Design a binder for this molecule. Structure first.
Ligand SMILES: CC(=O)N[C@@H]1[C@@H](O)[C@H](O[C@@H]2O[C@H](CO)[C@@H](O[C@@H]3O[C@H](CO)[C@@H](O)[C@H](O)[C@H]3NC(C)=O)[C@H](O)[C@H]2NC(C)=O)[C@@H](CO)O[C@H]1O
Lengths: 47, 46, 46
């Protein structure tokens, strides 16, 4: 549900959606490490 | 067939040369982490 | 309070510590250019 933008970190995404980082991680169990994601990939955000 | 220069990122090389970001990443599976590239590295242009 | 590993960038260190790039930049005003950190350099992680 969010397309990663250049420079984004998980904290920035968490700030934008006002949700904890661990909730975003739990929505994406296929991700090996968020340090491998690149801009233009889309991650799921639980509402 | 592009040599990384200081200051480059994979997104900047894709935007500057008009290559899609998923295409440049898929052309370069030898880059373990697309966020970490170094000057002098050669990357493939699809 | 953290030693830069070969292969670290400020963005990778921020993502490891669950913080943002501005926060790690703010903590390190001795770093002239946040894109350029060196192996073995000591930085602050707040
Ligand atoms: C896929 C994508 O574009 N990701 C973005 C990241 O690339 C970008 O981080 C910056 O990445 C470059 C390239 O890896 C880093 O430069 C490297 O930095 C190290 C440590 O200083 C240095 O040894 C390398 O020589 C140098 N390489 C080059 C080619 O100059 C740069 O430091 C990263 N910047 C930061 C602040 O961590 C991040 C952040 O802009 O965004 C991703 O979206």
């Amino acid at each position: 549900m969010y397309t990663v933008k250049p420079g984004d970190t998980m904290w920035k995404i968490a700030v934008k959606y006002q949700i904890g980082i661990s909730e975003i991680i739990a929505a994406n169990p296929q991700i090996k490490n968020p340090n491998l994601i690149y801009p233009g990939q889309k991650i799921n955000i639980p509402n």
